[PDB]
Symmetry: C2
Subunit: 167 residues, 2 copies
């Protein structure tokens, strides 16, 4: 069970955090996680390349579709919707969507879900990390909601696997 990751990209960060999620929330053994220039995962007979094939293999192996997807709120539709837009946007956020991210979070603890962190939160967390990390205090106060939420994800999902340093 070895998962190999890149080290400059948010696709790897997502995968590390999902694992932290799997342990934080769900739960047997866990992947090795070595480093390389490209993303891969080999399990038993099979082999998987890229984030998405990798992601689904991971979710499949840990049975954790419902928890990451808010199946129990029928917000599955909405989770892959959010995470599909983002991976096609190449994980970049424009001010306009930063603003609307910040509105969602005024009145919700999590981006899609009511109850708990889902796959949408893990995706947006690693995407905003650097555009939030490299930031001035005066500006955040515009996105104080994204800020409050970022810290809640950081102090609750982050564990051994994630290497991103605390803000």
């Amino acid at each position: 069970c070895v998962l190999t990751l890149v080290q400059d990209d948010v696709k790897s960060d997502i995968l590390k955090l999902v694992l932290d999620f799997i342990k934080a929330v769900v739960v047997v053994a866990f992947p090795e996680v070595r480093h390389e220039k490209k993303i891969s995962f080999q399990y038993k007979d099979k082999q998987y390349k890229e984030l998405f094939c990798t992601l689904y293999a991971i979710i499949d192996i840990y049975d954790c579709y419902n928890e990451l997807f808010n199946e129990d709120e029928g917000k599955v539709s909405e989770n892959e919707e959010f995470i599909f837009h983002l991976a096609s946007d190449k994980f970049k956020l424009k001010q306009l969507d930063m603003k609307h991210l910040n509105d969602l979070l005024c009145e919700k603890s999590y981006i899609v879900s009511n109850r708990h962190a889902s796959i949408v939160d893990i995706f947006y967390f690693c995407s905003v990390y650097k555009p939030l990390s490299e930031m001035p205090a005066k500006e955040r106060v515009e996105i104080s909601h994204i800020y409050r939420w970022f810290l809640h994800i950081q102090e609750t999902l982050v564990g051994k696997f994630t290497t991103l340093k605390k803000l």
Copy 2:
């Protein structure tokens, strides 16, 4: 090996066509394909719900990632990019992107790939089917490229599994 599908939606059409693709291009047994109001696939021990979990299970079982994704042209990046935008757009095409679809196809046989039909072509084929099916001849001539390409996909990938009637 039973795959159960919806019947009013393009998510099912995509899955049927992928199977037709698997036989047309790749290639052992094949799924039963019964009908219901929701998408599902059960294989051996495991069970899968929705199009994407279903899709990846299918691709995983038939080993056909490279062929659907143009791995051999390193256009994997670009394939999931195209198909992620579309599934988040809820499989609807605006005139502006219809127009740009139609430009791609003036000078390319397939949407992303040079060589062969990929996962992007299967996705856009089922999405444009009805906005193309319910159409006037005068208008198509604007999208004559999308039209030429639609017929090429229809006469080459379509097989037993797809139920959409010929245009």
